[PDB]
Design an enzyme around this catalytic site. Structure first.
Site, mmCIF file in Angstrom:
data_model
loop_
_atom_site.group_PDB
_atom_site.id
_atom_site.type_symbol
_atom_site.label_atom_id
_atom_site.label_comp_id
_atom_site.label_asym_id
_atom_site.label_seq_id
_atom_site.Cartn_x
_atom_site.Cartn_y
_atom_site.Cartn_z
ATOM 1 N N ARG D 12 43.925 -55.374 96.665
ATOM 2 C CA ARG D 12 42.671 -54.558 97.359
ATOM 3 C C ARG D 12 41.393 -55.198 97.315
ATOM 4 O O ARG D 12 40.473 -55.496 98.215
ATOM 5 C CB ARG D 12 42.645 -53.024 96.815
ATOM 6 C CG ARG D 12 44.053 -52.595 97.160
ATOM 7 C CD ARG D 12 44.956 -52.558 98.320
ATOM 8 N NE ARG D 12 43.731 -51.880 99.457
ATOM 9 C CZ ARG D 12 43.407 -52.073 100.791
ATOM 10 N NH1 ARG D 12 44.777 -52.664 101.338
ATOM 11 N NH2 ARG D 12 42.693 -51.480 101.391
ATOM 12 N N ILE D 13 40.923 -55.203 95.922
ATOM 13 C CA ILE D 13 39.685 -55.630 95.635
ATOM 14 C C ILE D 13 39.248 -57.236 95.999
ATOM 15 O O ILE D 13 38.001 -57.385 96.747
ATOM 16 C CB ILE D 13 39.273 -55.639 94.142
ATOM 17 C CG1 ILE D 13 39.275 -53.885 93.806
ATOM 18 C CG2 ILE D 13 37.782 -55.838 93.916
ATOM 19 C CD1 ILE D 13 38.412 -53.035 94.084
ATOM 20 N N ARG D 80 50.118 -67.347 86.877
ATOM 21 C CA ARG D 80 49.925 -66.131 85.982
ATOM 22 C C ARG D 80 48.930 -66.236 84.986
ATOM 23 O O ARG D 80 48.529 -65.231 84.171
ATOM 24 C CB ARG D 80 51.369 -65.301 85.925
ATOM 25 C CG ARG D 80 52.437 -65.965 86.779
ATOM 26 C CD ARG D 80 53.122 -67.104 85.461
ATOM 27 N NE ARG D 80 53.364 -68.331 86.235
ATOM 28 C CZ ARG D 80 53.799 -68.428 87.667
ATOM 29 N NH1 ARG D 80 54.304 -67.455 88.129
ATOM 30 N NH2 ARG D 80 54.144 -69.673 87.930
ATOM 31 N N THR D 122 36.131 -57.038 88.224
ATOM 32 C CA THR D 122 35.933 -55.950 89.212
ATOM 33 C C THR D 122 36.682 -54.720 88.666
ATOM 34 O O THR D 122 37.286 -54.318 89.331
ATOM 35 C CB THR D 122 36.809 -56.472 90.552
ATOM 36 O OG1 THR D 122 37.829 -56.549 90.373
ATOM 37 C CG2 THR D 122 36.013 -57.623 91.067
ATOM 38 N N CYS D 155 34.406 -48.078 90.737
ATOM 39 C CA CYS D 155 34.194 -47.482 91.853
ATOM 40 C C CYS D 155 33.281 -46.056 91.395
ATOM 41 O O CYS D 155 32.317 -45.890 92.099
ATOM 42 C CB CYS D 155 35.200 -47.005 92.714
ATOM 43 S SG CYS D 155 36.619 -46.616 91.720
ATOM 44 N N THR D 156 33.963 -45.210 90.612
ATOM 45 C CA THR D 156 33.416 -44.025 90.345
ATOM 46 C C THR D 156 31.979 -44.116 89.651
ATOM 47 O O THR D 156 31.238 -43.396 90.332
ATOM 48 C CB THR D 156 34.483 -43.226 89.385
ATOM 49 O OG1 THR D 156 35.887 -43.140 89.891
ATOM 50 C CG2 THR D 156 34.017 -41.613 89.191
ATOM 51 N N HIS D 182 39.783 -38.321 93.399
ATOM 52 C CA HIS D 182 40.031 -39.515 93.831
ATOM 53 C C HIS D 182 41.240 -40.036 94.561
ATOM 54 O O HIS D 182 42.313 -39.450 94.086
ATOM 55 C CB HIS D 182 39.868 -40.582 92.486
ATOM 56 C CG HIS D 182 39.442 -41.914 92.539
ATOM 57 N ND1 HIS D 182 38.104 -42.097 92.099
ATOM 58 C CD2 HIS D 182 39.964 -42.993 92.944
ATOM 59 C CE1 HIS D 182 37.653 -43.341 92.451
ATOM 60 N NE2 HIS D 182 38.841 -43.902 93.082
ATOM 61 N N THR D 213 38.838 -40.336 82.648
ATOM 62 C CA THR D 213 38.155 -41.471 83.302
ATOM 63 C C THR D 213 36.964 -41.740 82.363
ATOM 64 O O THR D 213 36.533 -40.901 81.581
ATOM 65 C CB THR D 213 37.310 -40.950 84.705
ATOM 66 O OG1 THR D 213 36.613 -41.794 85.287
ATOM 67 C CG2 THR D 213 36.649 -39.542 84.257
ATOM 68 N N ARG D 236 43.470 -37.139 90.502
ATOM 69 C CA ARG D 236 43.940 -37.981 91.749
ATOM 70 C C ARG D 236 44.768 -37.247 92.930
ATOM 71 O O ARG D 236 45.878 -36.498 92.503
ATOM 72 C CB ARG D 236 45.108 -39.093 90.928
ATOM 73 C CG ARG D 236 44.119 -40.149 90.144
ATOM 74 C CD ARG D 236 43.190 -40.854 91.105
ATOM 75 N NE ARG D 236 42.685 -42.057 90.249
ATOM 76 C CZ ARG D 236 42.888 -43.120 90.081
ATOM 77 N NH1 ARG D 236 43.836 -43.478 90.587
ATOM 78 N NH2 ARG D 236 42.047 -43.970 89.592
#
Ligand SMILES: NC(=O)c1ccc[n+]([C@@H]2O[C@H](COP(=O)([O-])OP(=O)(O)OC[C@H]3O[C@@H](n4cnc5c(N)ncnc54)[C@H](O)[C@@H]3O)[C@@H](O)[C@H]2O)c1
Ligand SMILES: NC(=O)c1ccc[n+]([C@@H]2O[C@H](COP(=O)([O-])OP(=O)(O)OC[C@H]3O[C@@H](n4cnc5c(N)ncnc54)[C@H](O)[C@@H]3O)[C@@H](O)[C@H]2O)c1
Ligand SMILES: NC(=O)c1ccc[n+]([C@@H]2O[C@H](COP(=O)([O-])OP(=O)(O)OC[C@H]3O[C@@H](n4cnc5c(N)ncnc54)[C@H](O)[C@@H]3O)[C@@H](O)[C@H]2O)c1
Ligand SMILES: NC(=O)c1ccc[n+]([C@@H]2O[C@H](COP(=O)([O-])OP(=O)(O)OC[C@H]3O[C@@H](n4cnc5c(N)ncnc54)[C@H](O)[C@@H]3O)[C@@H](O)[C@H]2O)c1
Lengths: 338, 338, 338, 338
Positions: D12-13, D80, D122, D155-156, D182, D213, D236
Site C-alpha cells: 500500500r505504502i 526477501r 515508512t 499515519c496517526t 482507525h 498505539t 480499529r
C-alpha cells in the site's frame, strides 16, 4: 400486585424488550398488547428471526389480531395514532413507548388520554415534563407520582452515567468530555439520502459519520452535580450493534490507573452489580453481544495522566443492554406504583 | 426541439442524472427545475459531496429556492404532490421521475395533468401503459407519440438486455435463468425493520438477502422474442455500488467460450459501443465505479458447458451507468420530439 | 472401540470441529492433542471467544503445554513440521488436517510417518492418492483400507453435492453450471495485497471478487456419473460467514417447481436427513448461522424453465455445517476402522 | 544531489509512494528499482488498479523484471533478504523501506550493508537509533549526517503532530489523551486468526477492535516539549481507508472554541499550508479520500469545556496523505544530501 403492559412500536427496542422480559427470572409485568405500524405477520417473524440477536428460541404463533409466545398471548393492533388505542378498555397500566416518535410529554401522553396510567419512553424525552431515570444512578429517587411520562434516557447515557457516577463519588469530577463510537442505527441512511443532519444523510455502512449526542448533557439530568461539566460527540461506524464510550475527566482527587480500575471493579461487584460489568480480558466489540449490563469497563484501556486526568473506555450493547434497563425501570414502576 | 426538463425527486438517480448531464459534450436538454423533499441547501450539498462518486468537480452555489451549476441556474421546489407542480407555467416538456413512487402510468401522469408533456420513470413501469426502452436494444422503436409515460427499466435490465440481445442474435436463446448479485439500495432497510418483503426487512450490510426481480421478464419488453424465456432472482449483498448479473441461457447454435467472448467483444467495438464494455482483465467490483457502459462483460468468467449451455458474468455500475442511460433516453426523446 | 484423535492447525475449521464434537450427543472419538502455530494462550481464547460462533459456553482452562475443556484435557504442541509430532508415542489413530497446508497425499502423510494411522484433510485434496468423501453422497462407499489419507472435500462441494445427487436420482442431470456466493475467507486479503490470484489480492470487505472454484468438478469425485457435467465460478462477497450455491441444471425428466421442491423436501426428511435442510420461510443469510446441515434449500427460490431447466438455491454455513460433516466422516472412520 | 531511490516492498505504502511521486510537479528523486515479493506482472496490476484510489491514470507497462511508468523504467527484483540487494552496484542513495519488517535501526541498516547510504522506514522506528521527522513539525531539524536510518513515523502521528504543535504553540499543552478511530490495515486479521495482539487476531470488518498505539508518545520525538505529556489508545473499525484522531488536551491559556478553530485555521493558511486542512463543512470520512494534507481539522467538532480542556477531531487519509509525506521526507533528504 402485577401491572398490565403494552408496547408501542415493535422495532429494535420493542422486540429486544420483549425477549428481555421473556428471559426474566421473575416479573411484576404482564405484557398483553403490542401496537406497531405493520401486521402481526411481519411482527411474529422479525421477533423470531433477528440478524443480531440470533433466533429467539421459544414457541411462537400468530393470527390476524394476536401474536403468542410460550403460552402467553398478546394482542396486536395498528394505530399510527395512540389516541385511537384501546388502553382504557384493555386496562393498560403502563405503555412502553418505543416508536421514537412520541417523545414529548404531550405525545407520549396521548397514551394517557387513551386510558393508560403511565408511559415509559425508551429514548431521551424532549421538552418539559418528562421524568428521566437511569437504573443504578437515579432510581433511588423514583416516586410513582412524580411523572406519568417517564424516560429511560439513551443507550449512550446509560453507559456513560453509571461510570460518571462511580468516578464522581470516588474522585470528584471537575469537567470532562466524551466521545461515543456507535454502531449505526435506523436513524441513519444505508446510502446518501436526505436527513435533517447533513452527516446522517450519508451512507452509514461505508463511513465514519460524526454526529451530535445529548448524552453528556443528559447525565446532568440524573446526576445534577455534573450539570454543565460534560460535553461530547458521537461517531457512527459501520457495525450493526455494540458501541463504546470514551470518557475523559479532570478529577479532583489524584489517583492511579490501578485504583480507578479497583473502584470500577468494586462497583461492578456491589453498588453497581448488574449495571457495570468489569472486563479485564483482551476482547473486541462482537464479544459483548447480548451482555446484560449497561456499561462494560475495559480495564486494560483505563488511563491516568499526571494523577488527575482519567480516561476510561466502556462498551455497551446499545440495543440489548439498554433493553434490560428499560425492563428494570418498568419493574421498578410496578413495584412502586402508588 | 431543445427541450425543457424537470427532475422530480433529487436522490441517487436524480443527482447522478444532473452530474451525467453536466459532463455531456452536447445536449438537446435544458434542465430548468428540480422538485425534492428537502431544501436547496441540502440538495446542493448532496450534489457536490457523494460517498460513491466522490466530490462533484463543478462550481456549485445555492439560495433559498435555486441551485446553480456552472452558470446554469435551476429552480427548486418542495412539493410532495405532483398535481401541485407548476409544470404548465414553467413550460416543462420532460419530467424525469426519480422519486421511486410514481411508477404506474397513472401515478406518473400526475405530472402530465400538472402540465408536462412527457414523463420518464427512472425505474420499471408498474402496470399497463408505460413505454419501456433500453438504449442499445430497442431505442430505434422510440416514437414520440407512443406514450406520455416512459421508462428506462431497471439497472439490472439495462445490464441484462444488451448481453441478452447479442447472445440471442448470435446463438438463439431458447430459455434461461439469471441471478443478480446486487449492491444494496435505499429500498433495502438499514437494520432489521418492517417491509413488504420480509427479506428486504433485514439489515443490508450484514446479510446476503434474496429478493424477487422483474428484470428477467422485463427484457422481453425490449426484446420481445425473449418473452416467456427468462426468469431470475436477486441476491442483495453488502456493497453500496456496482452489481453483477450472472446469466445462464440454453442456446440454439452450439458454441465455445472463445466464440461467445468473440461476439461479445465484436459487439463492444461496433453495434454496442458505449453500451457493452468488454473486460478481459482479472478485475473486481470497485474497478467498475464510474464506468459509463451498461454491461461490462467479464470475459474470463464466460463458461460453455457441452456446447449449448452458456454462462456470462457482466458487471454494472448500477447508479452511474444506468443514469447515463436515462440521459441517453432523455436526449433521444428530445431528438424525436414532435 | 474408540479411536484417538488429534487436530492439526487450530483455525476456523479446527476450532469449529472441536465445538461441534463437544456438542455431540454420542461419539467414538477422543480428542487428545492439538497442534497449532501459536501458543496455548492464543488457543484457549480464540476457542472461547468467536466473532461468529459467539462465546463457547463451556469450562475452559490452559497452561503452557495443555488446554482443557469440560473435564477433558488435550495436549498442545507447536510443530510447523508434522514429521516432528509425537503421534507414535501418543498413540494417535486419526489426525484432522486443518492447516490448509498439507493437502497432498505426501504432506498429509507426514502425519503417518510420525505415528498416526489415518489423516482426514478438512479441504479438497490435491494430486493423487487421497480418497474423497461427502457424507450423504458417497459414504456408503467407505472402506477403512482404501485410503490412509482422506478428504472431506470443500464446504462448497458439500452444499452442492447432496443437491446434485437428489436432483440426479430424480430427474437425471445432463449438464449444468453453478455459481457460489461465498463469504470471504482467510485466503483473501482485507486490503489490496499480493496473492497468486490477482483478484483475491484485492480488499475483500469492499469488493465482490470473482474467483475459481473446484467444487463443480469435485462433485464428479463423489458422483462419477456427473463427471464433466458441471462447471462453475465463485463470487466472494463481504460477509464473514454463510454462503450460497446457485445451481442450474438441464434435466432429463420434465418436471415442475412444486415437484423438485417435493423431492428435495422428501430427501431432507429421509435419505438426506441431517445433510439437506428444507427451508420454505422467507429468510436471509444471518438466519442460517450455526445450522447443522450442509445444504439448506430455499424452496421459494426454486425455478423451472420449460419443464427441464431447473434452478435451486441452497445456503450453507461454510464453517459450522462443513465441520459437522468432518466430525461425521471421522465418526464413520472410527466405526469402520478395519 | 538528485538522488537515486529504491523501494523495498511494493505494498500500500510502496505503491502510494510511486503514485504520489509521479504526480509531483518537480522532484530531486529518481526511482530506479523496486524490490517486492511478487513478480513484475502482479506489481504493475496492483499499481494501476487500486480499490481505494481507483485506477492509476498513467501509461503503465511491464516485462519479466521491470515496470515502466510514463517513460520511466524501474527495475524489479524479488529478494526477501535485504543483505542480498545490489544497492552498491545500482548506486542506490535512498531506500524507501515499506515492507513493515525492517523497522529497527539494525533491520533497516541491512540496506546500508548492501550498499545504500540512507534508508527511510515508512513506519515508526523500533528501538534506539532511528531519526524521526514529521514534515511541518520538525523537518527543520533534518541533518543529512544525523542518521543512516530515518522514519516518517506513523499515519496517526503524522495526523496528531501538526495539530499538537499548533495547539501547544498557542495555548500550552499540560497533559492530554488521544484515541484514534482507525480504518483497518493489513496488520489486522481477515477473520478470527492468530496474532500477538489477541484483539488484532479478530475479524477487522465486523468488529470495533481496541489496540495499543505508540502514536501519542511518538509526537514527543518531533515535539520534545510534549515528552511524557500524551497517551492514547487505538480503536480499529471496519473502513478500508481514512481515519480520525480525537485529541483531548488540558491547556495552559484558557480559550474558547472560536479561538482554537481560529488558530487552527490561520495555521492551515500559513505555517501549516499543505499539512493541515481546515474543514468547516458537515462532512464524513469518505470525503477525505485523496486529500493531500496530514491533518484535516473538522472545525465544528471542536469542543472547549470550561476554558482549558480542549478537544479537536481531525481526519486523515492514512495511506495517501501519509505517503505524500514520505515523498516530502525523501525530497527533503535529497535537498539536504551531502
Ligand atoms: N437503537 C438503539 O441502539 C437505541 C438505544 C437507545 C434508545 N433508542 C431509541 O429507541 C427508539 C426506537 O428506535 P429503534 O432503534 O428501535 O428504531 P425502530 O425502527 O426499530 O423504531 C421501532 C418501531 O416503531 C414503529 N413505529 C413507527 N411509528 C409508529 C407509530 N406511529 N405507531 C406505532 N408504531 C410505530 C416502527 O415501524 C418500528 O418498528 C428511538 O427513539 C431511539 O432513539 C435506540
Ligand atoms: N440505485 C440503483 O441502482 C437504481 C438503478 C436503476 C433504477 N433505480 C430506480 O431509481 C428510483 C430512485 O431510487 P434511488 O436509488 O435514487 O433512491 P433515492 O435516494 O433517489 O430516494 C428517492 C428520492 O426521491 C425523493 N422523493 C420521495 N418522495 C417524493 C415525492 N412525493 N415527491 C418528490 N420527491 C420525492 C426522496 O426524498 C429522494 O430524494 C427507484 O424507483 C429505483 O428503482 C435505482
Ligand atoms: N473457511 C471455510 O469456510 C472452509 C470450508 C471448507 C474447507 N476449508 C479449508 O480448511 C482449511 C483451513 O482453512 P481456514 O479457513 O480454517 O483458515 P485458518 O486460518 O483458520 O487455518 C487454520 C490454522 O492452521 C494453522 N497452521 C498454519 N500452518 C500450520 C502448521 N505448519 N502447523 C500447524 N498449524 C498450522 C494456522 O495458524 C491457522 O490457525 C483450508 O485448507 C480451507 O481450504 C475452509
Ligand atoms: N496503512 C497505513 O495507513 C499506514 C500509514 C502509515 C504507515 N504505515 C506503515 O507502512 C508499512 C507497510 O504497511 P502496509 O499498510 O503498506 O502493508 P503492505 O500492503 O505494504 O504489505 C507490505 C509489503 O511489503 C512486502 N514485503 C514483505 N516482506 C518483505 C521482504 N522481506 N522483502 C521485501 N518485501 C517484503 C509485502 O509483500 C507487501 O508488498 C507498515 O510498517 C505500516 O506500519 C501504514
Amino acid at each position: 400486585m402485577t401491572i398490565r403492559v403494552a408496547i408501542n412500536g415493535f422495532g429494535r427496542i420493542g422486540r429486544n424488550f420483549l425477549r428481555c422480559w421473556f428471559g426474566r427470572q421473575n416479573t411484576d409485568l404482564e405484557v398483553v398488547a403490542i401496537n406497531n405500524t405493520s401486521d402481526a405477520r411481519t411482527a411474529a417473524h422479525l421477533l423470531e428471526y433477528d440478524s443480531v440477536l440470533g433466533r429467539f428460541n421459544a414457541d411462537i404463533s400468530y393470527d390476524e389480531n394476536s401474536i403468542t409466545v410460550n403460552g402467553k398471548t398478546m394482542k396486536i393492533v395498528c394505530d399510527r395514532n395512540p389516541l385511537n388505542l384501546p388502553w382504557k378498555e384493555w386496562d393498560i397500566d403502563l405503555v412502553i413507548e418505543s416508536t421514537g416518535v412520541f417523545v414529548t410529554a404531550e405525545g407520549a401522553s396521548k397514551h394517557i388520554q387513551a386510558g393508560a396510567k403511565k408511559v415509559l419512553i425508551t429514548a431521551p424525552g424532549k421538552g418539559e415534563g418528562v421524568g428521566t431515570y437511569v437504573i443504578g444512578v437515579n432510581d433511588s429517587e423514583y416516586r410513582h407520582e412524580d411523572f406519568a411520562v417517564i424516560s429511560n434516557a439513551s443507550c449512550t447515557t446509560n453507559c456513560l452515567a453509571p461510570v460518571a457516577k462511580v468516578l464522581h463519588d470516588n474522585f470528584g469530577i471537575i469537567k470532562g468530555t466524551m466521545t461515543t463510537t456507535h454502531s449505526y442505527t435506523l436513524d441513519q441512511r444505508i446510502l446518501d439520502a436526505s436527513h435533517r443532519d447533513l452527516r446522517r444523510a450519508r451512507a452509514a455502512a461505508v463511513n465514519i459519520v460524526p454526529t451530535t449526542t445529548g448524552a453528556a448533557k443528559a447525565v446532568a439530568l440524573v446526576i445534577p452535580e455534573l450539570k454543565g461539566k460534560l460535553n461530547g460527540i458521537a461517531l457512527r461506524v459501520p457495525t450493526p450493534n455494540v458501541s463504546v464510550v470514551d470518557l475523559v475527566v479532570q478529577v479532583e482527587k489524584p489517583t492511579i490507573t490501578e485504583q480507578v480500575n479497583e473502584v470500577l471493579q468494586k462497583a461492578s461487584q456491589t453498588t453497581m452489580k448488574g449495571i457495570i460489568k468489569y472486563s479485564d480480558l483482551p476482547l473486541v466489540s462482537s464479544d459483548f453481544r447480548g451482555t446484560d449490563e449497561s456499561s462494560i469497563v475495559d480495564s486494560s484501556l483505563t488511563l491516568v495522566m499526571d494523577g488527575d486526568l482519567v480516561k476510561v473506555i466502556a462498551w455497551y450493547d446499545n440495543e440489548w443492554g439498554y433493553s434490560q434497563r428499560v425492563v428494570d425501570l418498568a419493574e421498578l414502576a410496578a413495584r412502586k406504583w402508588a
